[PDB]
Design a protein around this ligand. Structure first.
Ligand SMILES: CC(C)[C@H](CO)Nc1nc(Nc2cccc(Cl)c2)c2ncn(C(C)C)c2n1
Length: 256
């Protein structure tokens, strides 16, 4: 059975906001040689979906909870965003569509992806995305918080779609829609939900952002009754075949 001795440490990927994540190589059969990302801890984690990180092994060792997950070669969207400082609508439509599927699934499991942001969206070698650091059902980066969360008036699935809107805006413009000089001001800007629409954005993109940026979570796109479909049927994704996207048949615009 699983055991820390079955994995040799290759290198530390980075300090964590969830513990430390190491790049490990399994030493035991049958996946001997296979690379994995190892997370050590001192609430669901098992989800099966093309756009959600897979948990391969989980074992407790005296206070330490080891999680062996997929190693995503491509790194995260935050890193790519910083280097390219903004993606074309083409790239954005693609990442958001796959994210749309991943997110909705997590919502069906009754999970709320509270920490949705580019840092938590990984890319595999093919360029497809994979959501990480999810799981919590019973609840951060302020720039991504929905107004009901800032005011602590609740935190349902709707909150995620607002954050989804923020991710879209940041990838499309290189900037955050609501940014103050400090956390306080940012939260106040989120509450006013006062938003200027950059003129280089397509009308379809602008339409979608306006629908996602509804202060009242009940009027926010994704708030049913067709839930995620409400967002998937938006004109912004007209050219997206969800069937093949799910099957990973759509060619990623970016290849790491
Ligand atoms: C430690 C952080 C700097 C990074 C990026 O957010 N985290 C990260 N990078 C990953 N991949 C990755 C690939 C190439 C270079 C670098 Cl620095 C990271 C990764 N693969 C699988 N997971 C989790 C499910 C644990 C991962 N998590």
């Amino acid at each position: 059975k699983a055991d820390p001795s079955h994995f040799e440490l290759l290198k530390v990927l980075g300090q964590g906001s969830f513990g430390k994540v190491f790049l490990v190589r399994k030493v035991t059969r049958p996946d001997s040689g296979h690379l994995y990302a190892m997370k050590v801890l001192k609430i669901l984690a098992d989800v099966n979906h093309p756009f959600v990180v897979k948990l391969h092994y989980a074992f407790q060792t005296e206070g330490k909870l080891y999680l062996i997950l997929d190693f995503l070669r491509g790194g995260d969207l935050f890193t790519r965003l910083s280097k390219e400082v903004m993606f074309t609508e083409e790239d954005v439509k693609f990442y958001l569509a796959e994210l749309a599927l991943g997110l909705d699934h997590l919502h069906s499991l009754g999970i709320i992806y509270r920490d949705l942001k580019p840092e938590n969206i990984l890319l595999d070698e093919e360029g497809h995305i994979k959501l990480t650091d999810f799981g919590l059902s019973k609840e951060g980066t302020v720039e991504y918080m929905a107004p009901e969360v800032v005011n602590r008036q609740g935190h349902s699935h709707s909150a995620d779609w607002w954050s989804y809107g923020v991710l879209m805006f940041e990838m499309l413009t290189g900037s955050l829609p609501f940014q103050g000089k400090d956390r306080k001001e940012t939260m106040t800007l989120i509450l006013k939900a006062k938003l200027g629409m950059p003129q280089f954005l397509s009308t379809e993109a602008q339409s979608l952002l306006r629908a996602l940026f509804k202060r009242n979570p009940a009027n926010r796109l994704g708030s049913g009754p067709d839930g995620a479909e409400e967002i998937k049927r938006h004109v912004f994704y007209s050219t997206i075949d969800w069937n093949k996207l799910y099957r990973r048949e759509i060619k990623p615009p970016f290849k790491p």
